[PDB]
């Protein structure tokens, strides 16, 4: 379960709206906001 979602949008940097679809461990979240995305986005896991 390594791929978990997507960012969609014309400008992912709060100049415009964008769509987040992200399947986290507990419950998938879908959101449409003027998101200010990170230059290198990911989700992290403690292993063992």
């Amino acid at each position: 379960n390594i791929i978990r979602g997507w960012i969609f949008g014309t400008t992912l940097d709060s100049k415009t709206q964008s769509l987040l679809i992200v399947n986290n461990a507990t419950n998938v979240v879908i959101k449409v906001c003027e998101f200010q995305f990170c230059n290198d986005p990911f989700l992290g896991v403690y292993y063992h």
């Binding site: 379960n1 390594i2 791929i3 960012i7 969609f8 949008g9 992200v22 992290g44």
Partner: protein
């Protein structure tokens, strides 16, 4: 993403492939239609 109606179709197939997109045929069933109303020209996946 048509007229803001961001439409998702999907399928899940059990495989045993090692290093390629599995050769074969399957049709995706529509699951949900989001009324998002935004400009989607770009996208980026989220990984763990």
């Amino acid at each position: 993403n048509i007229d803001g109606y961001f439409k998702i179709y999907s399928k899940h197939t059990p495989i045993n492939l090692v290093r390629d997109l599995p050769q074969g045929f399957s049709a995706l069933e529509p699951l949900v239609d989001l009324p998002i109303g935004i400009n989607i020209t770009r996208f980026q996946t989220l990984l763990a």
